[PDB]
């Protein structure tokens, strides 16, 4: 679990085809607003 | 090209019905895929006549259709005409539970590798399972995301809670500003996170990371709800009770961040916080295990001293020794 400490240290540092295998990553954009933007 | 026409026909067939029955059928086929032999039960697919490669392609086509339907124009048109996200009450949280359970199960089956060439198909199946997960969340507004993420935290399984915290962290890291009511909705998750950290050590450390992210994102504007968190952090750093080194360092980083955000509010806790911290570093100074433990402890001192310079006077001599 030493990896999560490193991000926490990075988190303080701010304070001053690909097969997916994890749920941590980018944020999906809302599909309904992408629908309503163009077709409606 | 047969895939495209057949999937369009299936899209029309599914979207003829309403959204509730569609999502219920998705959960039912998720269960049916979960109960497959992988080489009583309602036999709908004939394993006996079909080859194993055909069953493999069956699972692959099923999950691909799941994702494509959730991304299809017809389904979104049906949702918008039906009224919007408010039609989906109660369905979304059970859908998240089912998707996370199935993806954890297929990941565990992938860990049970038989080598040969099944490994590639299992990796692809995990990839489209995560595609299903990412498309389920895209139909879920940020307002409804918080009660369901709380419920997923309340799930008994340990991997589902980890996936929930990962999704919460992802939404928290998107560097986009927030409306006031949404910030108040985020604020309510703090007691539940404090309950989680206070179980697997990764879950507690991830909860501490979520608390640190919340304190970074909103701690400047609404400091008061973060006052209890620091208290719990001190109870973690106290040397009377033993804690995992990995969660001890994360507790130290949370201490540093919260004391940075709570510059003056941390005064009453300083008589309890400061004697413990020193002792911890001494032990961390004795250990030669890794750089990160010592660096986190030094971060704790640096932020405590910089944010609150004038109150370490009764402890001053002590820290000078720890300086040397």
UniProtKB/Swiss-Prot annotation, chain A:
Expressed in which tissues: Widely expressed (at protein level).
Source domain of life: Eukaryota
Modification type Citrulline: residues: 6
Cell compartments where the protein resides: Nucleus, Nucleolus
Post-translational modification: Citrullinated by PADI4.
Function: Part of the small subunit (SSU) processome, first precursor of the small eukaryotic ribosomal subunit. During the assembly of the SSU processome in the nucleolus, many ribosome biogenesis factors, an RNA chaperone and ribosomal proteins associate with the nascent pre-rRNA and work in concert to generate RNA folding, modifications, rearrangements and cleavage as well as targeted degradation of pre-ribosomal RNA by the RNA exosome. Acts as a chaperone that specifically mediates the integration of RPS19 in state post-A1. Direct regulator of SIRT1.
Assembly and interaction partners: Part of the small subunit (SSU) processome, composed of more than 70 proteins and the RNA chaperone small nucleolar RNA (snoRNA) U3. Interacts with RPS19; the interaction is direct and mediates the integration of RPS19 in state post-A1. Interacts with SIRT1.
Family to which the UniProt record says this protein belongs: Belongs to the AROS family.
Protein name (Swiss-Prot/TrEMBL): Active regulator of SIRT1
Source species taxonomy: Eukaryota, Metazoa, Chordata, Craniata, Vertebrata
Residues of the full protein shown: 2 to 68 of 136
UniProtKB/Swiss-Prot annotation, chain B:
Top-level taxon of origin: Eukaryota
Protein localization: Nucleus, Nucleolus
Membrane spanning residue stretches: none
Placement of HEAT repeats on the sequence: 139-177, 267-307
Oligomer status and interactors: Part of the small subunit (SSU) processome, composed of more than 70 proteins and the RNA chaperone small nucleolar RNA (snoRNA) U3. Interacts with MYC; the interaction is required for localization of MYC to the nucleolus.
Note: The protein described in this entry is essential for the tumorigenic capacity of precancerous glioblastoma stem cells and their proliferation during tumorigenesis. The protein is overexpressed in patient derived glioblastoma tissue compared to control brains. Overexpression is more pronounced in high grade glioblastomas compared to low grade samples, and expression levels inversely correlate with patient survivability.
Similarity field: Belongs to the HEATR1/UTP10 family.
Stated role: Ribosome biogenesis factor; required for recruitment of Myc to nucleoli. Involved in nucleolar processing of pre-18S ribosomal RNA. Required for optimal pre-ribosomal RNA transcription by RNA polymerase I. Part of the small subunit (SSU) processome, first precursor of the small eukaryotic ribosomal subunit.
Name of this chain's protein: HEAT repeat-containing protein 1
Species for this entry: Homo sapiens (Human)
Residues of the full protein shown: 1438 to 1787 of 2144
């Amino acid at each position: 679990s030493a990896a999560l400490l490193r991000r926490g240290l990075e988190l303080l540092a701010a304070s001053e085809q690909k097969l997916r295998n994890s749920a941590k990553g980018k944020v999906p954009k809302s599909a309904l607003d992408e629908y309503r933007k163009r077709e409606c | 090209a047969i895939l495209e026409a057949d999937t369009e026909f299936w899209f029309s067939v599914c979207c003829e019905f309403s959204v509730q029955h569609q999502i219920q059928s998705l959960m039912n086929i998720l269960q049916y895929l979960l109960k497959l032999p992988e080489e009583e039960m309602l036999q709908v697919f004939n394993v006996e006549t079909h080859t194993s490669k055909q069953l493999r392609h069956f699972k692959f086509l099923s999950v691909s259709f799941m994702s494509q339907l959730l991304s299809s124009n017809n389904f979104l048109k049906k949702v918008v005409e039906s009224g919007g996200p408010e039609i989906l009450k109660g369905l979304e949280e059970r859908l998240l539970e089912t998707v996370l359970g199935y993806i954890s199960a297929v990941a565990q089956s992938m860990e049970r590798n038989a080598d040969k060439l099944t490994v590639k198909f299992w990796r692809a199946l995990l990839s489209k399972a995560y595609d299903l997960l990412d498309k389920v969340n895209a139909l879920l507004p940020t307002e409804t995301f918080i009660p369901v993420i709380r419920g997923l935290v309340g799930n008994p399984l340990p991997s589902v809670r980890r996936k929930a915290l990962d999704l919460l962290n992802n939404k928290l890291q998107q560097n986009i500003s927030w409306k006031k009511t949404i910030v108040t909705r985020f604020l309510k998750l703090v007691p539940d996170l404090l309950a989680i950290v206070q179980e697997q050590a990764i879950n507690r450390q991830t909860a501490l990371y979520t608390l640190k992210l919340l304190c970074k994102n909103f701690g400047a504007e609404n400091p008061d709800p973060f006052v209890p968190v620091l208290n719990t952090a001190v109870k973690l750093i106290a040397p009377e009770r033993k804690e995992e080194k990995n969660v001890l360092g994360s507790a130290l980083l949370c201490i540093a961040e919260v004391t940075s955000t709570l510059e003056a509010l941390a005064i009453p806790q300083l008589p309890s916080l400061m004697p413990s911290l020193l002792t911890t570093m001494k032990n961390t100074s004795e250990l030669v295990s890794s750089e990160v433990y010592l660096l986190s402890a030094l971060a704790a001192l640096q932020k405590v001293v910089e944010t609150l310079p004038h109150f370490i006077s009764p402890y001053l001599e002590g820290i000078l020794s720890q300086v040397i």
